[PDB]
């Protein structure tokens, strides 16, 4: 920070407002066109949205950082260095064809994720010259168009653009957490109430760009825009935007990485055993490299991303369209959900049920009162005006149509809560009939007609009233309030400040029945390990008599005032062991999913909101539905067609099977890796030679790989996708110990067999061992997959899918006839005689009997 731009702020804050408007060349009316251009000449323009792109050739090292191709790499090259053009060749196209996939794979994110903040669709209101003839007005118009001495109005909700100084504010509170580090809002008022000068960033009467304003409404008048800004750059995202990669490639990397680990602890070991035993120290580390080379499958990040992609193929014809692959990880391993009651737990259609006064007896003049508010309404059509429309008889609305003629309508505004329409039957007197929500019913009202007498309003009748529409939620009826006045006839155009001491008729009552199919869904979503959490914005009462017909046990409810005066981890605490949250604003519902963020659960939240959105931008995995407003589809994860829980619900058991087969894949691969890897460590003392070759080795993960294509096509038992997903190497590292052992003793057994049996017991006639280990390496891998892919019994219990069996036996004709090929003179590779078939045969089926066996002893 220079000290000459930290005193400039301290002058403009302290200095008049007066003088300010000559200062910046600017009127308290507005900027024409003229004087917005020449101040954007002289001063310059504000920080434009662009951004710095990323270039094609800076994109592929960031697409190439990851530990398994630079491991890859490492690999290629040295085979490369010991005289191996075939194998190097081979791992540069695996590493190619990983890197390609995951190019297109990043642009998809970058796509689907291309910053923090879109600073593109951020607009700022100006009052501008919109009729270019003093009416001016207010514009919604880019940051960077944003001159300096322009007038601005700030909103809650509303990020600052530029430097501006507080002309007028009402109760103004923006979070400088980012320019000054504390998070608590600092109160932004008109005029500097702080004593102490000469602290610019702390200074009340100024704002600084970057910083939101919490709440409250202000205008002010931009003071620097540019380069000039306090925060400098606040744009030079050029390098290192996305930081954070997806959770799919870190689970690819954290997998890699475990056998990085095995392979530096491993290698090594057998670099010493073989290498001191025989001093041939060139073979040592020939044996270190076919150690290394052993345990890394060539086509993991390839198998693993087809599964995914599959996963997003197969949901998008359940009416799950999800947007990202890695979106899937976390559709599998999510366990609460959180979501909105209408339209998920009730159906949007809202019949009307009841005509009740205050009273609560059975009137209609609350009918005839409600239906020309409802009628002669020019507004935006409303489902539930449709609805008490509806709710009326026909000759009754005709007769009403005739004696009554429309006059003046005040549109609704959340301000207010409510909506007037002014109607009159003569030209003496006109009739304002007004209907909304109940507390601001009786907050503009001053009189009410009980038993169609007028009564002054004590606080009696407001308690009893209280009660009676207490009694009618918990029913779990939305009440609406409907108030009249009389006013003499007038020319003038009544506004918001004409509903005031009005007559309140009486309240109108309505319900929305719950889905049919949402008790079942909301009973399977427990089955599946989800706790399903309603964050409702409606009544307590309403939220809690709604989850009864549901099923869902609503227990006791929290309110959102409560929830205001916790901190983070006692509302953590509370949000565990509840259900139900009840007037609830959208940052309640925003800290409320980070608060359940934080223990581990994958929290998902459902929402079709415009106000929704940041709500789907904090959790885990936001939900959101075609229909709904844009930006919350655009800020989702999954869009899924419709809403409905038993999508939902199918969806989150699909997206279980993809992940339950993307592991399942990794476990098998990691296993039948370290058992031949440990086959080679324990053998490579005796063997002057080495057991296989790095070019043999390859080859046989290859073609294992080839076969493991398949297995997003696999068929996962229901016992896999009963609970949610977790992925975690202290499992894979400990069903490779147990898993591997078991290869290594009958592949110890091969070594026998050849080192005696076939007499290949010189160096001279390695092939012959080194052939023949491979034929049956590469069959029992492919084979053991039905054996271990499933808890319960391989074939008369639980079987495998069509392709998966198909390619296991492609894969073995491969092996077994590959020697038997002009292939083999290139791959080091002779042909077996005819007496090692048998042997194999019963190699293999013993393997296969006994792994099956061990098996049970996993728990
Ligand atoms: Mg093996």
Not at 569 to 591: C, G, V, W
Request: proline share 5%; glycine share 6%.
């Amino acid at each position: 920070v220079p000290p000459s731009l930290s005193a400039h702020c301290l002058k403009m804050a302290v200095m008049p407002e007066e003088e300010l408007w000559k200062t910046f060349d600017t009127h308290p009316e507005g900027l024409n066109q003229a004087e917005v251009e020449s101040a954007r000449e002289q001063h310059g323009e504000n920080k434009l949205p662009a951004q710095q792109p990323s270039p094609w050739w800076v994109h592929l090292w960031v697409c190439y950082r990851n530990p398994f191709n630079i491991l890859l790499t490492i690999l290629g090259a040295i085979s490369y260095a010991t005289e191996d053009l075939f194998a190097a060749g081979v791992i540069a196209l695996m590493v190619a064809i990983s890197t390609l996939l995951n190019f297109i794979q990043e642009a998809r994110s970058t796509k689907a994720a291309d910053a923090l903040k879109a600073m593109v669709s951020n607009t700022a209101t100006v009052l501008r010259v919109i009729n270019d003839k003093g009416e001016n007005g207010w514009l919604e118009i880019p940051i960077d168009q944003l001159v300096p001495g322009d007038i601005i109005k700030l909103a809650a909700g509303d990020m600052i653009p530029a430097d501006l100084r507080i002309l007028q504010a009402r109760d103004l509170f923006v979070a400088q957490a980012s320019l000054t580090g504390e998070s608590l809002p600092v109160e932004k008022a008109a005029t500097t109430r702080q004593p102490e000068h000469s602290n610019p960033l702390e200074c009340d009467t100024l704002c600084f760009m970057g910083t939101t304003v919490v709440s409250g409404t202000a205008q002010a008048m931009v003071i620097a825009t540019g380069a000039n800004t306090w925060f400098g750059q606040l744009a030079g995202r050029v390098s290192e935007q996305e930081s954070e990669p997806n959770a799919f490639q870190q689970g690819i990397s954290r997998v890699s990485m475990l056998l990085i680990r095995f392979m530096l602890v491993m290698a090594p070991v057998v670099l010493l055993i073989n290498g001191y035993t025989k001093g041939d120290w060139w073979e040592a580390a020939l044996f270190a490299l076919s150690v290394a080379v052993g345990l890394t499958p060539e086509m993991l990040p390839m198998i693993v991303t087809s599964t995914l992609a599959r996963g997003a193929v197969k949901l998008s014809k359940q009416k799950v369209i999800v947007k990202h692959l890695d979106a899937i990880q976390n559709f599998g391993a999510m366990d609460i959900l959180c979501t909105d009651k209408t339209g998920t737990l009730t159906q949007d259609k809202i019949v009307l049920e009841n005509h009740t006064d205050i009273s609560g007896k059975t009137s209609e003049r609350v009918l005839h009162s409600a239906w020309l508010n409802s009628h002669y309404q020019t507004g935006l059509k409303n489902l539930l005006d449709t609805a008490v429309l509806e709710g009326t008889d026909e000759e009754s609305a005709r007769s009403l149509a005739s004696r009554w003629q429309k006059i003046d309508e005040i549109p609704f505004d959340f301000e207010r809560r409510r909506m007037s329409v002014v109607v009159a039957e003569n030209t003496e007197h006109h009739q304002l009939v007004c209907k909304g929500a109940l507390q601001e019913i009786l907050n503009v009202c001053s009189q009410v007609r009980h038993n169609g007498e007028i009564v002054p309003l004590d606080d009696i009748m407001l308690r009893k009233i209280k009660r009676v529409t207490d009694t009618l939620n918990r029913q779990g009826l939305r009440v609406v309030a409907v108030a009249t006045k009389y006013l003499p006839a007038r020319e003038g155009d009544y506004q918001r400040a004409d509903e005031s001491d009005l007559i309140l008729e009486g309240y109108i009552a309505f319900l929305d029945p719950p889905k049919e199919t949402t008790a079942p869904a909301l009973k399977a979503l427990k089955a599946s390990g989800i706790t399903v959490k309603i964050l409702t914005g409606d009544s307590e009462l309403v939220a809690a008599k709604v989850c009864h017909e549901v099923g869902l046990d609503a227990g006791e409810v929290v309110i959102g005032s409560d929830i205001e005066t916790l901190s983070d981890d006692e509302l953590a605490n509370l949000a565990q062991r509840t259900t139900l949250f009840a007037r609830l604003t959208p940052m309640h519902k925003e800290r409320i999913v980070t608060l359940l963020k934080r223990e581990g659960h994958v929290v998902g939240f459902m929402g079709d909101g415009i106000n929704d959105a940041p709500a789907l931008r904090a959790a885990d995995i936001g939900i959101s539905v075609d229909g709904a407003v844009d930006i919350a589809r655009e800020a989702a994860d999954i869009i899924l067609l419709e809403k409905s829980l038993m999508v939902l619900e199918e969806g989150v058991i699909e997206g279980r099977r993809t992940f339950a087969n993307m592991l399942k894949y990794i476990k098998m691969t990691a296993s039948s890796n370290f058992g031949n890897v440990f086959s080679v460590l324990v053998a490579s003392a005796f063997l002057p030679f080495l057991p296989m070759l790095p070019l043999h080795l390859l080859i046989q993960n290859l073609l294992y790989d080839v076969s493991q294509v398949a297995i997003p096509f696999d068929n996962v038992d229901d016992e896999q996708i009963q609970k949610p997903q977790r992925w975690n190497p202290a499992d894979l590292g400990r069903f490779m110990i147990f898993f591997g052992p078991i290869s290594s003793i009958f592949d110890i057994l091969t070594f026998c067999l050849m080192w005696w049996v076939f007499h290949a017991n010189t160096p001279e006639t390695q092939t012959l061992f080194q052939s023949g280990w491979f034929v049956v390496g590469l069959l029992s891998q492919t084979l053991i997959v039905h054996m271990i892919r499933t808890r319960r019994v391989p074939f008369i219990q639980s079987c495998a899918s069509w392709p998966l069996m198909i390619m296991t036996v492609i894969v073995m004709i491969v092996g077994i006839a590959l020697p038997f090929s002009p292939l083999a003179s290139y791959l080091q590779l002779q042909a077996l005689p005819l007496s090692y078939f048998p042997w194999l045969v019963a190699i293999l089926a013993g393997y296969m009997t006994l792994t099956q066996l061990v098996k049970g002893f996993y728990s």
